[PDB]
PDB file of N, CA and C and ligand atoms in Angstrom:
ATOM      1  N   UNK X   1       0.807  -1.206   0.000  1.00 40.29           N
ATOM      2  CA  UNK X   1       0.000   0.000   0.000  1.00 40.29           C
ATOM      3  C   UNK X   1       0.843   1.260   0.000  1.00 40.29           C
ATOM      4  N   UNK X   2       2.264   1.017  -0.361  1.00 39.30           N
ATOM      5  CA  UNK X   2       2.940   2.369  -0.409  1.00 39.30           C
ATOM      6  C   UNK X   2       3.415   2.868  -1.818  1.00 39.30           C
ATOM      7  N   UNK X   3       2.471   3.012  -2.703  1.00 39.45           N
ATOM      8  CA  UNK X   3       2.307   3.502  -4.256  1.00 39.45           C
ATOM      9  C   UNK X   3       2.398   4.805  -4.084  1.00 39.45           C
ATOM     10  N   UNK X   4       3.808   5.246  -4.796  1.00 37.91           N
ATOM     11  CA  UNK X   4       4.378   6.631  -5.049  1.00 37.91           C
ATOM     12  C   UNK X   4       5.731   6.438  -6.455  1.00 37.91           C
ATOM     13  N   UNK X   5       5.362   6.750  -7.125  1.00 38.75           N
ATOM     14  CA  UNK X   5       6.204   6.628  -8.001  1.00 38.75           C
ATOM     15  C   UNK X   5       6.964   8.461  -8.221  1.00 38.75           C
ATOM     16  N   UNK X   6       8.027   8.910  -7.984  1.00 36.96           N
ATOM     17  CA  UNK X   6       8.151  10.348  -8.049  1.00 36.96           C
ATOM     18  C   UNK X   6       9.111  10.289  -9.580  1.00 36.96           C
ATOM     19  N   UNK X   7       8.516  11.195 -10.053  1.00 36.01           N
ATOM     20  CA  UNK X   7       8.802  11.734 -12.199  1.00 36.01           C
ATOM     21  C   UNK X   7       7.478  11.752 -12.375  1.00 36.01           C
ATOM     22  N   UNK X   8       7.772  11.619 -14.333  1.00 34.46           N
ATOM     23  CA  UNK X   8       6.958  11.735 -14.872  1.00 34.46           C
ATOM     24  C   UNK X   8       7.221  10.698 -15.883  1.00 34.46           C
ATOM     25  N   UNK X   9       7.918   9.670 -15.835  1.00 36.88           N
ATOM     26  CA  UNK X   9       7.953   8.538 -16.731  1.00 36.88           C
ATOM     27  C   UNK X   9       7.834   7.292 -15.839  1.00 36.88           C
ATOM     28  N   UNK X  10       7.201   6.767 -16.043  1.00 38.36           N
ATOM     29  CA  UNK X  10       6.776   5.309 -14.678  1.00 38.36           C
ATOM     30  C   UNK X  10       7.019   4.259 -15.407  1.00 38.36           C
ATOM     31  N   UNK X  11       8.518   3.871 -15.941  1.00 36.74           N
ATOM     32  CA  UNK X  11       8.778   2.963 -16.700  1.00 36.74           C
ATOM     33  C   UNK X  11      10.329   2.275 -15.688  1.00 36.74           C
ATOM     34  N   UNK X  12       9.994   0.776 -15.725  1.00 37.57           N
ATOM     35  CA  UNK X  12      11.249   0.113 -15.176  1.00 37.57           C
ATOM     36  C   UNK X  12      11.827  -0.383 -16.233  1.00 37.57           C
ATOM     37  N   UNK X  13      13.068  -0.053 -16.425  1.00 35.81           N
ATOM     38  CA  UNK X  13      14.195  -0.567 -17.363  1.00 35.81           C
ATOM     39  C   UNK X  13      14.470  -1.848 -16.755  1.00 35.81           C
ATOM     40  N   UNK X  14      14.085  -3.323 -18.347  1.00 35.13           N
ATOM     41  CA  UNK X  14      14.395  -4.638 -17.188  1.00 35.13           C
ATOM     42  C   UNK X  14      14.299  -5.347 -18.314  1.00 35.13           C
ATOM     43  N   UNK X  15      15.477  -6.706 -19.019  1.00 33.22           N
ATOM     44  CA  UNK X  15      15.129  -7.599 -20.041  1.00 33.22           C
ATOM     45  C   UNK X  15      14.675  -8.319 -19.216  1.00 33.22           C
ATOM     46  N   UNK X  16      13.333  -8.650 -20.343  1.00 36.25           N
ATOM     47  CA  UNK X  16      12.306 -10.467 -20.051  1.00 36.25           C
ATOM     48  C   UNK X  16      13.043 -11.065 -20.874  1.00 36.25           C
ATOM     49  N   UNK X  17      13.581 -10.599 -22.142  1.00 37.56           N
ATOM     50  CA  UNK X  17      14.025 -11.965 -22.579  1.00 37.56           C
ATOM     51  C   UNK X  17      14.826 -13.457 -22.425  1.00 37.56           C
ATOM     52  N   UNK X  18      15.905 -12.640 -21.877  1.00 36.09           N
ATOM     53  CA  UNK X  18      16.979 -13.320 -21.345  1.00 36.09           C
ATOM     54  C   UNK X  18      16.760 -12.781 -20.001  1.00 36.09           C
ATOM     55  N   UNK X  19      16.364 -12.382 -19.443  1.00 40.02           N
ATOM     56  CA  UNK X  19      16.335 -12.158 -17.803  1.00 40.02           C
ATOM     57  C   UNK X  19      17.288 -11.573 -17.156  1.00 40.02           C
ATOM     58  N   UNK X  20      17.929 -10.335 -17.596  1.00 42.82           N
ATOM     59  CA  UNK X  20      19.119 -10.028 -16.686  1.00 42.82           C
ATOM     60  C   UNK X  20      19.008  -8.251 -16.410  1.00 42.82           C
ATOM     61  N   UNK X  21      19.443  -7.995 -15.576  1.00 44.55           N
ATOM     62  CA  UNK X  21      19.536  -6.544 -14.897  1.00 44.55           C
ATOM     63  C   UNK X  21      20.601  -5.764 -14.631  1.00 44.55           C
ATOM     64  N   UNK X  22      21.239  -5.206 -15.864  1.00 43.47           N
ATOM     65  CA  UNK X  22      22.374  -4.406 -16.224  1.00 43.47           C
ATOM     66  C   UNK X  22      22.174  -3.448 -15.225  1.00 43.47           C
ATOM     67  N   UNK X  23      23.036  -2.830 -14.589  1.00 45.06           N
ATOM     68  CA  UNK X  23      23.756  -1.783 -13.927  1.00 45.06           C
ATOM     69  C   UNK X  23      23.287  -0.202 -14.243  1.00 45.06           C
ATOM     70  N   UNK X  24      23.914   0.046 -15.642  1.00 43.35           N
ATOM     71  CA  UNK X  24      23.434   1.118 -16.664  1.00 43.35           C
ATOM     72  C   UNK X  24      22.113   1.167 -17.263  1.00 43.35           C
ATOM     73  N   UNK X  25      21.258   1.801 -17.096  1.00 46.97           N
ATOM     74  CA  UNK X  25      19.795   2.132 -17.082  1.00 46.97           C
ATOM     75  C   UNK X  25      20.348   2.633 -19.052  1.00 46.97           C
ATOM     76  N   UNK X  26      21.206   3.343 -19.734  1.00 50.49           N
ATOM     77  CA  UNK X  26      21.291   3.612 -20.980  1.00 50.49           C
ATOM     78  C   UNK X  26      21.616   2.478 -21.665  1.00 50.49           C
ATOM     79  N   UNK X  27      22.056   1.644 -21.108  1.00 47.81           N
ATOM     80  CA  UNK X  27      22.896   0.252 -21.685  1.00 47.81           C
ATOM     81  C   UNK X  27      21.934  -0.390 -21.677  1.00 47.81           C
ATOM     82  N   UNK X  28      20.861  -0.936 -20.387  1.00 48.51           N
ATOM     83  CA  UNK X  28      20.124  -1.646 -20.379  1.00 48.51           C
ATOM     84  C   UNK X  28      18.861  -1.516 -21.693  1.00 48.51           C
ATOM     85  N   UNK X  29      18.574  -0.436 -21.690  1.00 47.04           N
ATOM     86  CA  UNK X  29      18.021   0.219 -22.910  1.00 47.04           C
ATOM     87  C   UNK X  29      18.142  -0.360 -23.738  1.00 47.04           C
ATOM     88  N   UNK X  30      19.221  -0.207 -24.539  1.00 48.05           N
ATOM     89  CA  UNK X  30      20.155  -1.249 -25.486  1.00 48.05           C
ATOM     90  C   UNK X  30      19.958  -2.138 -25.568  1.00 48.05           C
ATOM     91  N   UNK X  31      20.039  -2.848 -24.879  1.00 50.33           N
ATOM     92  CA  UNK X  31      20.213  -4.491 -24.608  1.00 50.33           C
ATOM     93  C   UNK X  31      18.685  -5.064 -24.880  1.00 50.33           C
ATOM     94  N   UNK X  32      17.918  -4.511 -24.226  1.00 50.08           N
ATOM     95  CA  UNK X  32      16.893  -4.859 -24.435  1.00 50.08           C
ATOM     96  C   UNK X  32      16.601  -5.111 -26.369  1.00 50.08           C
ATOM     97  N   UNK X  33      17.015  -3.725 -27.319  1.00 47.54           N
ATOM     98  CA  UNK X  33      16.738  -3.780 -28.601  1.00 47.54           C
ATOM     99  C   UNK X  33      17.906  -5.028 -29.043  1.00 47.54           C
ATOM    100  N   UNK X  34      18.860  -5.285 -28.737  1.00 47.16           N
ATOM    101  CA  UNK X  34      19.408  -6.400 -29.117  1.00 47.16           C
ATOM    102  C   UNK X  34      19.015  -7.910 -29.261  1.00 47.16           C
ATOM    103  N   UNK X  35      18.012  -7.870 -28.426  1.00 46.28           N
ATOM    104  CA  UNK X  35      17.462  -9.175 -28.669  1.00 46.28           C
ATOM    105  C   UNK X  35      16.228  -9.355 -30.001  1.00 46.28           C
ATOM    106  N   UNK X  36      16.991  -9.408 -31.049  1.00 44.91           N
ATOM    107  CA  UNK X  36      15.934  -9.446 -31.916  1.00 44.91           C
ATOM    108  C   UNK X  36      16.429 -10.450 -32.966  1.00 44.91           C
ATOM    109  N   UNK X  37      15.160 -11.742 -32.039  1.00 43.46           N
ATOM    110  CA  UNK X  37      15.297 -13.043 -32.613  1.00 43.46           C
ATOM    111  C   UNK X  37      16.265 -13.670 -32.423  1.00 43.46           C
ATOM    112  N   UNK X  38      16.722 -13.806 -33.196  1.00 46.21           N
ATOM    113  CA  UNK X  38      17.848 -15.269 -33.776  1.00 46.21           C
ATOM    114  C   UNK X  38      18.348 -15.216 -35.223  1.00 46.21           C
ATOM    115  N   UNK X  39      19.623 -14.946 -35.162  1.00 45.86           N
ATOM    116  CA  UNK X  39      20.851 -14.769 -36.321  1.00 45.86           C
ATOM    117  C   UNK X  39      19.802 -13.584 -37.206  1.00 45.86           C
ATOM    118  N   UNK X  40      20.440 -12.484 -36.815  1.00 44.47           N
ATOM    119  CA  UNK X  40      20.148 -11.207 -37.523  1.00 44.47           C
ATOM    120  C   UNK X  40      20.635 -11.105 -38.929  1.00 44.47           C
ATOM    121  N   UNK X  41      20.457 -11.602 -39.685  1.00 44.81           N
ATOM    122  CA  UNK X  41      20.689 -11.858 -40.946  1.00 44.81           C
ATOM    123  C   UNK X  41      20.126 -10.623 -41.900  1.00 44.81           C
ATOM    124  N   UNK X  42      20.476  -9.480 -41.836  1.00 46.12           N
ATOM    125  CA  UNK X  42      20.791  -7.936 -42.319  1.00 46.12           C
ATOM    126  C   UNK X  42      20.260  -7.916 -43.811  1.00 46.12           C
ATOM    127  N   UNK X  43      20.158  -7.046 -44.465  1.00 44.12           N
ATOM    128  CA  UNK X  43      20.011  -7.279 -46.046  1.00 44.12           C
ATOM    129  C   UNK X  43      21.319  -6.953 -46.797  1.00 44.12           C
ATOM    130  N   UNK X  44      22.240  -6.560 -46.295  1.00 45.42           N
ATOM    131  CA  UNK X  44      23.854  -6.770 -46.994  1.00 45.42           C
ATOM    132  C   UNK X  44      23.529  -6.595 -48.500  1.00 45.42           C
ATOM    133  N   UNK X  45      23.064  -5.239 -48.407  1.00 45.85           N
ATOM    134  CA  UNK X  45      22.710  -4.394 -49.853  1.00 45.85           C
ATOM    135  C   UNK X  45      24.329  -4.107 -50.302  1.00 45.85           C
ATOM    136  N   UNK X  46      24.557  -3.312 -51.299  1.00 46.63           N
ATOM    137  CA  UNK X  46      25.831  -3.411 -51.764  1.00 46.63           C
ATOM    138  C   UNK X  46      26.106  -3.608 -53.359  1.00 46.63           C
TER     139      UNK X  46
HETATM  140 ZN1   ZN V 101      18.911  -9.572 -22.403  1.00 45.84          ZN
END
């Protein structure tokens, strides 16, 4: 019963995918967009 969140962005930085809790709140960020899928296979235009 002690709901206080103080800002104005009420967001927890946290991967579900792999489950882990980086240090760096900018990194974690990151990390999170890194998980996308399995063998990122790019379009290697050129
Ligand atoms: Zn992760």
């Amino acid at each position: 019963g002690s709901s206080g969140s103080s800002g104005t962005g009420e967001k927890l930085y946290n991967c579900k995918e792999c489950g882990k809790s980086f240090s760096r709140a900018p990194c974690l960020l990151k990390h999170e967009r890194l998980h996308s899928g399995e063998k990122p296979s790019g379009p290697s235009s050129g």
